[PDB]
Ligand binder design. Structure first.
Ligand code: MN
Ligand code: MN
Ligand code: MN
Ligand code: MN
Ligand code: MN
Ligand code: MN
Ligand code: ZN
Ligand code: ZN
Ligand code: ZN
Ligand code: ZN
Ligand code: ZN
Ligand code: ZN
Lengths: 253, 254, 257, 257, 257, 257
């Protein structure tokens, strides 16, 4: 297994003892994803990508963070939806910080933080900064971290044309995530429940408290009507290949 | 599904709209469990118990907390072992607090926290208190929480005897109890042949910090799991599930 | 008098809020390196200048600006390893925003526009807003409304982008110390800009991931993400008018008389 | 002069730590209801009295005790719904322990014994210790050693338990306001105990789980978890001597001359 | 019965609060060096003794005192570089005060007097009170009233000042370990004061600013900011009676029956 | 040529710091009501102006000032119940000071002067400094020195106090919005003062204790603690020159090459 949770402490210790072991931590969220998909999507996708990348490059995968930062209207629909269960920023930051501190204690020095929930980004960044500050105080400056959101690896316009024949800041519960889920966890997707509505549009600013009227009723920012397993397989291949390459580049054996 | 994570928000909303929906939250840890078992035991076990209880009483299971408080020498071997990845007290407390705040926002009012890592106890308690305090400021005083550890529902002497025929002796970390449950639920994550059959750990009537590695058995286990078995696990599982299910029925009546 | 709250007596401020529909604006910036050709308080100066003009135009008031913001990130500000850049931890910035909102609510104010001038501040401003609103709710206050925006998000008209980047536009994710900010500075504070010191290097490019601790080798030596060689006061005057007009219209829409 | 740090001048304290092997002791208690027969500062008084006696025998010093502890839990202290009980949040107690350790390290001390008199304090004391030791490590200090204990754990001799509970032993789980604590008070502070007010009732029994908010109906009315009817000064003297010599010997072994 | 809450059973405490007009008092001190002639717990001992006497006269109750206070400052307490002085971080003291007020409110109490014996604690006590009152407001409680004071401020009668300082009065600024505190200690705790050890040095003088890290050379070697050579039991008794009667009347005025 | 860090490029700042012996100055103020005759940013404006002039004479640099300070207290600033006054929680202010010192240390700076213009900020600035210095030590830095002061403390010469208060001096305790600040504003920012609006009331007097929640009836209606009727540009010019050379000389003494 590539999952740290499924290893004995002796197996884990042996792996870290190699001195060049790469650890990966999926960071997601429990968030509404429309009428057609489950709420753990942001955990499932990065965990699936991590699993495959780890198998491909020989890394290990830490237990994923199941709860993330508050859902924002323009990226996740808004934190007023039922089901969505969010943490305060300080809580998420402290979790990332504590884990890095512990990995450093083990002797590990390479970590990939794979985000699957857009809103988590800056809180993961602060967690990394605070942890690295402490490590320096402990006399450790050789701990290296690579942070990324798996979905940022699908930029190639060529690939985009394939996913959107008819032609990113509106891909919550849409074609992208739904396609990936159809390729990975089809049993957790019910396409017949998709509400085919027009893409959500927003002015160049944000309003608080969140106004429910500004988010499409289903909670999705765009329709997943044209999602497919074929598209998900393409997305999966692009992400896994790209991320695996980045890791080989940043953490060579 | 009984797992909230596998439900769409409408399926979840529909259940809570009932008025007496019961939610369960597994709280575990990533901690060394000897040479014979994997490190996610404290998460796997409470989750498996929650799932079965949920199926029998019609409750829902929230995503489990994967990381818990620092492993203590006398209960989990110590936080000096590799693999064990622990949170500071404030972090765990804050996570529990945030989750309760959100569930209340959803309209839920019944929560069962099932702890699988001994050391988590008081931080789960503080998280609950701080959340309940805030709920009161929001005008909510009808949110009820039940906190329990599955390993506390096994008291029947007849059962204890079957589990420990050689005599019942706090030393269970990585021993017969957890190993048997794992053999029944996740046999592929256990290799009894790697078990180190050392005598139960004994400690002085106090604690020392920084933790002294010499005071913890080398394998990390506090007792031997040599006599662990699938059969014992099946017994423990059914006993805990039935006891917990009945307890929930009593505290959260339809 | 002035639209700056700091320049009003408490009686003047009280009278304004007593109107019941008074709009308050808070600029949020940073002290951060901006290359060899510009000063380091740009992120405070620009949103403050925009707030000033918008407030005067629509009849709002401007609160003292936050001079220090969140840690500079490599891909958006060059990185927090640079000398001069003086950053706050996330909790500190969040808490400052949270405290200000709590106090404005105490005064009786119920309308606030947060104008961000430093990209990295965004989510911490958001958390500060959320935590404050949560507290207001506990206090029995649910009519406080906040609008948060980055003045640079109001320049979209392709006709404008064309004039600003006749040679072509390569995204805004590289506008740190580039044509946009430098042009605004040339139009507002020309004395704090010296174009002859601009290093005309090609636009910085990055992979779709971040590395920590920050690697100095991945940021252009000058600290800028793109060259401001083609910056001008004319472009700045265009940017300024489009931003002021756009933000003023947005506030009129969200905070009607 | 005195074994209590608070009763020493800074010069006397300085001289004692300058020896290089000084052992410091910190009593950690609480202000909590202890039934109708005893006062509410028991959790502070007892560990302080035990520390004093141990200190006189080993040549240690006793720091001012922490008067406020963590929230009383139903199954161990009756519950935090009782009047009088005045509890701190976990972070507050943790921070207090952490701050004191940091200061003692500053003084040059490197040996500390924390004697907890309030069960609920345990994990927060442990966290305070860990956070302090982490900080000390960052400061280049790794020779600070801490021992944490409770006098309860030093009463294990069968011959002793039999003398204390001639009618059977049920464990320390239901001792709150019972025989053990009341007997010690009768021996040390007889004037703060009115045994004639003890409300006799069977030992508290609870299901294998906890409920929040705390349900007052699940705690015996008087607030005690067991009856102190059979408590006595004689039992208190026995417990005291047994705990003092046991703790004194534990300290000698962990902090050798 | 006793005026100390810690010495009451919860039943006795509940009855007193049930009256509806019960006043509670909380002494706040510190463990701090007090020269070569006095013990280090002076800041907690004095306010506790004054609270006790005030309470016996007005029928109030006294809570366990806070033994640890904020960091000693050079110009008020000598500096936090001295051995023995054991100080808390500001957040810790603030949180302790906040937690206690929250709990007293839960009890049903609505009147609190905080008597500070350590100058440096003042602002953290103030913040603790504000945060607690903010929370009470969120809980729907706005009738909790707090009075904060120090016995020092009740000694202003020229006639009394002359008797205490017949050679001249320079103010409270240099009183740390001086005539005022030492005289009170001589009248209340003679066993904890060894006047023969006093170092008769002139009043400490400092420049119009502070330096950090603290410079030990700027504090008189003994730790005192003025000489207690002229201190006496007689002056102590005078100070005590004046303070007790002044504080007692202040409380009657602020918390009318 | 400017002494303001915000108006320098990172290269110019880097050279000044790398040159060694660079003294940085940080103004810390507040947004607080200052009567009917003055604006609310006085506590920020004055220390910034003093710092600028001192910096120009000794070759120091001035950091962007902190615009928001700690809650106004009744006896020093009138109270935090006034509209306009916008205050931070203590932890927020301390964290801001702490983050700034950490960053300056990262830059390589080791000399900082904090000039406080809002009395209530003092202890939180102190805690910010201590927490920052603690961290620097963990980073292996023990040569960072901080000076904290207030221009108020540099006006002591009786000859000066004479010309300022020819009718008698009572102390700084009642100066909020009075002669001192108003005179400085008249000399530096006349357009932000309208002496005709001054309410000539007698100096505020308070009982020897504080009450919370704050009682509005105990603060003079205008918000001022004393009358600024006798304020003048001439007095302001005198105060300014006295403070500038006094502070300049103090810095030269504490920070020699
Ligand atoms: Mn998401
Ligand atoms: Mn465990
Ligand atoms: Mn910026
Ligand atoms: Mn207790
Ligand atoms: Mn003191
Ligand atoms: Mn002020
Ligand atoms: Zn998603
Ligand atoms: Zn386990
Ligand atoms: Zn900028
Ligand atoms: Zn007790
Ligand atoms: Zn004192
Ligand atoms: Zn002022």
């Amino acid at each position: 297994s590539v999952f740290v949770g499924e290893l004995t402490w002796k197996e884990y210790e042996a792996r870290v003892a190699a001195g060049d072991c790469v650890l990966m931590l999926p960071v997601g969220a429990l968030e509404q994803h429309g009428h057609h998909m489950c709420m753990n999507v942001d955990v499932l996708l990065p965990t699936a990508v991590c699993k495959r990348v780890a198998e491909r490059i020989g890394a290990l995968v830490m237990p994923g963070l199941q709860y993330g930062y508050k859902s924002q209207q323009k990226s996740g629909g808004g934190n007023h939806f039922p089901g969505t269960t969010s943490l305060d920023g300080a809580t998420l930051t402290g979790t990332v910080q504590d884990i890095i501190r512990e990995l450093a204690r083990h002797g590990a020095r390479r970590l990939v933080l794979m985000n699957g929930h857009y809103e988590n980004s800056m809180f993961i960044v602060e967690g990394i900064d605070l942890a690295l500050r402490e490590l320096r105080y402990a006399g450790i400056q050789d701990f290296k971290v690579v942070v990324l959101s798996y979905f940022d690896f699908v930029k190639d316009p060529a690939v985009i044309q394939q996913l959107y024949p008819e032609g990113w800041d509106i891909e919550h519960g849409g074609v992208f995530e739904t396609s990936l889920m159809l390729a990975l966890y089809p049993d957790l997707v019910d396409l017949d429940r998709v509400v085919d509505h027009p893409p959500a549009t927003f002015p160049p600013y944000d309003v608080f408290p969140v106004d429910p009227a500004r988010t499409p009723a289903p909670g999705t920012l765009s329709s997943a009507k044209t999602a497919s397993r074929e598209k998900g397989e393409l997305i999966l291949e692009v992400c896994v290949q790209g991320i695996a390459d980045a890791i080989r580049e940043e953490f060579p054996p």
